[PDB]
Amino acid sequence: MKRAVVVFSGGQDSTTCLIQALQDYDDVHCITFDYGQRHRAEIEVAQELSQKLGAAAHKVLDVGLLNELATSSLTRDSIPVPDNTFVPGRNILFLTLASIYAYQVGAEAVITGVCETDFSGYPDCRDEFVKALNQAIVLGIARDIRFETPLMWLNKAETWALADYYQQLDTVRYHTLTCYNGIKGDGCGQCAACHLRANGLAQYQKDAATVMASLKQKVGL
């Protein structure tokens, strides 16, 4: 049983990792980290998506303790902070919980859609970080689980190409949720996340062969 765990939220990136994973592994589980997120029903849609794509299971794990670690919460719980909703290292948490889950279901790999190519560069999403953490977790859980980051070096246009490579661009396009305002697919067209995704799609459509060439060159294939 060659089996993987996909850190999954039902958006373009994580559904593109799931689609690729379903070709490369015999068995794929999805895990979703719910901290306020979406809502029961959106998470439930993402579960129908994974179910309908072929995931063997989809665990939804409440990580609302993250929100307890925001400065506003801490000050509210009478904790002194030095004089935001920002919480550091959330992906350290996610990768740790996915590994514990992977251990328990016999998965050899945790797959995550993090990358270094966005405007904002989160240090818990850097290639160097993920490798460093992988090495620590392997020691702490006493098992060799790999961390895979198929989207590490990809821009959005290339991510669209990858979906297309597995012949599923339209699945991603119609049936995922990227929009901050809850609109599936192409979304409201008016939020940050809609812009990023739509720019990507439009570069890919204009210059497909070039972007596909770029994609193949970076990832193997």
Query: Distance (Å, rounded) from C-alpha 3 to C-alpha 106?
Result: 7
Query: Distance (Å, rounded) from C-alpha 28 to C-alpha 195?
Result: 30
Does 191 show up as a binding residue in the annotation? yes
Give the residue among 188, 178, 127, 129 at the shortest CA–CA distance from 16: 178
Residue 85 identity: T
Q: In the complex, what is the shortest distance from the CB of residue 169 to Zn ion, in angstroms, rounded to a whole number?
A: 19
> At 8, is the secondary structure helix, strand, or coil?
coil
179 binds, among a copy of itself, Zn ion, none (CB under 5 to 8 A by kind): Zn ion
Pick the stretch among 73-81, 108-116, 135-143, 171-179 that binds Zn ion (CB under 5 A). Answer: 171-179
Query: Distance (Å, rounded) from C-alpha 5 to C-alpha 25?
Result: 10
Q: In the complex, what is the shortest distance from the CB of residue 47 to Zn ion, in angstroms, rounded to a whole number?
A: 22
74 binds, among a copy of itself, Zn ion, none (CB under 5 to 8 A by kind): a copy of itself
Q: Supply 38's token pair.
A: 């979406």
**Interface with Zn ion, residue 136, by CB under 5 A:** no
Site residues (vs a copy of itself, CB under 8 A): 1, 29, 56-57, 59, 61-63, 65, 68-71, 74, 77-82, 87-89, 91-93, 96-97, 99-101, 103-106, 123-124, 126, 128-129, 132-133, 135-137, 139-143
* Residue 169 CB neighbours (<10 A): 19
26 binds, among a copy of itself, Zn ion, none (CB under 5 to 8 A by kind): none
Strand duo 3-7 + 109-111: pairing: parallel
**Interface with Zn ion, residue 194, by CB under 5 A:** yes
69 binds, among Zn ion, a copy of itself, none (CB under 5 to 8 A by kind): a copy of itself
> At 85, is the secondary structure helix, strand, or coil?
coil
Could you list the residues known to form a binding site for Zn(2+), using ranges: 179, 188, 191, 194
